[PDB]
Amino acid sequence: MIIGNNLHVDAFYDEATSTISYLVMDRETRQCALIDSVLDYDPKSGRTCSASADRLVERVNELNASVRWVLETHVHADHLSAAAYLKEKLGGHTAIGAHITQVQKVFGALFNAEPGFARDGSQFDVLLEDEEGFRIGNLQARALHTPGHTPACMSFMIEDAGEIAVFVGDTLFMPDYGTARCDFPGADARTLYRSIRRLLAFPDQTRLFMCHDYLPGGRDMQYVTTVAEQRASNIHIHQGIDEDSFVAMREARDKTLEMPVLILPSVQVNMRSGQLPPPEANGVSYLKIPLNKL
Amino acid sequence: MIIGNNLHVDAFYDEATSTISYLVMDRETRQCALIDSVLDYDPKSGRTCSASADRLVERVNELNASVRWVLETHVHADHLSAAAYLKEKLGGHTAIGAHITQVQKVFGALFNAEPGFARDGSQFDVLLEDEEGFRIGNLQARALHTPGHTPACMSFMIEDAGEIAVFVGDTLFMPDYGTARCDFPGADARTLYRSIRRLLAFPDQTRLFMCHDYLPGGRDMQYVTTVAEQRASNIHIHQGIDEDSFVAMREARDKTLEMPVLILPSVQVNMRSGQLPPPEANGVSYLKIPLNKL
């Protein structure tokens, strides 16, 4: 789809994890950003695969584009990131929220990481602060710190010709589905409420691009909505819902959810900017699954 | 159910893993064996739980029984063993096939086990050889080496009043379901054929007790059959099927199966006689998931 004149956005949906990855291109310079890419992972066998990522590679080439940014909205709990795989193939710089350091501190300890694992986000090329601008060719973008699902979550705002899009990560879902859970380490429902109200203070017509979609009641996949529709109809956080009410709802709801299938594999990879842990003396890399701890 | 006069057998079915565990008691002395017990494991969160095992504990106490043996037919790929939990709670000796050492060697390397990991089966109290006798109170039992699904698989024969039962592990399944897969390390279809033909050389009326049952076509769970019915009707290995034909079938079938959900957690625990790996310096135990190896 094209927003304004030059904001080109392709959505790629991963069936296994319900993740929506994006290719965001400046139609003029052909520079692009890949957002929230997926490295396929079979937890039964420990096998990774680049099939989903290769779709992005092919689309970049089909467009004659050049990757400038490999972005992650947050340290995902439900899938492994393909950012390292894609930066290697395609170039560009990886970026993530500056509060990655807090996530690394917490999960470096949980997974008892090896003593060379950096907790200062240096695995990533660029650490983004709240309201910090960045460019995708001639497109002006801005990173927004929108925590609550995690302490580090970012949303990416991009504007062209007076129209705005925001890639909101796991904050809002489609209006019929609600909002993201707030029970992972350092998550907080009240904080998510405030983040979402900042997002919903953008102009009504602003397009909002989802990070996951779970096909509720078997409808087709959806990935884009507007500020106006969220404010009117989001089942969790429409305009009528105050902070306290949201917090009570969200916290009671979180108590009923199970862990994502891939939380332990995912976080320990994504905290390393999409690298597998360093191999042991036998040449094999291992995920570590903490027992009776998470 | 009672075989002969004094061979008491209770079956316990685990829905999550389709494992059938057994309590086998001498009705006279009340001495018993627990076979192929399940320690519940949620791979998403890394949590173990003793719910299934506690069913056995309760049944032992209800019977006023005393555990003499905690047995495993093989190093299971589909569930974690509760043998260590049950031996601590109830006493008795653990036993497993003497060829455990070959499994330990192979998986000690795969999981790059810590140096204190023994590859001589010393984690188990007793290592059983082919046709070796053992007692459950006044009941005469015999261990049979029946490899093919794994190099170390054992079947346990028990006799009373001229009637025989055999707990066959993952060799035969019910006649309508066939036989076990032969693709795990050191498995071999030809070897499994020969093992099954030894089992099917027992008297026709011999009862055979299954290790898994997968409710094919939505039928109710079944766990016991006879030598005669297997020879007549087993869809994979009835009397009419020769060795070469079985091998071609079994090998072509194995190429289509996926890994068990819990293969990597299960085998690194079961190779340790049901102990979790020893904790690291932070006091947490971890499973190791080899990446891109299995």
Ligand SMILES: N[C@@H](CCC(=O)N[C@@H](CS)C(=O)NCC(=O)O)C(=O)O
């Ligand atoms: N069953 C899913 C759980 C996915 C999940 O929990 N996703 C998070 C975002 S990372 C969420 O907020 N789900 C929202 C909800 O269920 O209300 C899985 O195993 O991946």
Ligand SMILES: N[C@@H](CCC(=O)N[C@@H](CS)C(=O)NCC(=O)O)C(=O)O
């Ligand atoms: N889907 C099952 C796979 C279970 C499995 O592979 N069971 C083995 C015994 S440990 C088997 O032989 N299956 C035989 C077949 O389907 O032909 C799981 O995830 O646990």
Ligand SMILES: [Fe+3]
């Ligand atoms: Fe998320």
Ligand SMILES: [Fe+3]
């Ligand atoms: Fe098995």
